């Protein structure tokens, strides 16, 4: 599909069985999801943004479906105000920027 | 052009007669550039992101050339970790997300 940028590019994604709304973010290297109790082993990580850094939990090889498009990879979980789909997953669904 | 996301989507922009490198960011409502001098009056503003909020200077109706395409809009200047072109200007150059 083709998504215009008049409003925030939010789409539905499926992870850990739950359906959530997430922002297609070309400005994020990684995918960061709001705090949620995901099972599995994880590693600590710090990610930076505007303002500073926050601590998050890193989970590897987590299946994520974006608009019916299947992907799998690293997902970071922490105190973010919005669910963010970064480039690590965007490249997997053949997403590009065009103008 | 069509831009893939295996690497950060950086492009050259020209503003105030200067050339700079900026990140095409669909996850940002506004455009925020690193501290620099710009003609005109500016109003203090605050914007937020992953690691909290920061104080920025707001300049209105500023011409910005992005990859050869012209845009004229609001440009925020402050202590951002990187130059960011947000949706306010991305929509002006007809940018979209596709997959």
């Amino acid at each position: 599909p083709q998504i215009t940028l008049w409003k925030r590019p939010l789409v539905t994604i499926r992870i850990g069985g739950q359906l959530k709304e997430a922002l297609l973010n070309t400005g994020a290297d990684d995918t960061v999801l709001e705090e949620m109790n995901l099972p599995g082993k994880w590693k600590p990580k710090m990610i930076g943004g505007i303002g500073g850094f926050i601590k998050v939990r890193q989970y590897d090889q987590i299946p994520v479906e974006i608009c019916g498009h299947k992907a799998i990879g690293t997902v970071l979980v922490g105190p973010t105000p919005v669910n963010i789909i970064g480039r690590n997953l965007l490249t997997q669904i053949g997403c590009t920027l065009n103008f | 052009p069509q831009i893939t996301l295996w690497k950060r989507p950086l492009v050259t922009i020209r503003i105030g007669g200067q050339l700079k490198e900026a990140l095409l960011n669909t996850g940002a409502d506004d455009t925020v550039l690193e501290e620099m001098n710009l003609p005109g009056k500016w109003k203090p503003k605050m914007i937020g992101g992953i690691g909290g909020f920061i104080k920025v200077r707001q300049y209105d109706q500023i011409p910005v050339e992005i990859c050869g395409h012209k845009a004229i809009g609001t440009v925020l200047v402050g202590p951002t970790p990187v130059n960011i072109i947000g949706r306010n200007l991305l929509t002006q150059i007809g940018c979209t997300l596709n997959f």
């Binding site: 990610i47 943004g49 105000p81 | 990140l23 937020g48 992953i50």
Partner: peptide, 9 residues
């Protein structure tokens, strides 16, 4: 507004 730049470092 909200600027969600994320540095994977």
């Amino acid at each position: 507004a909200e600027t969600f730049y994320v540095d994977g470092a």
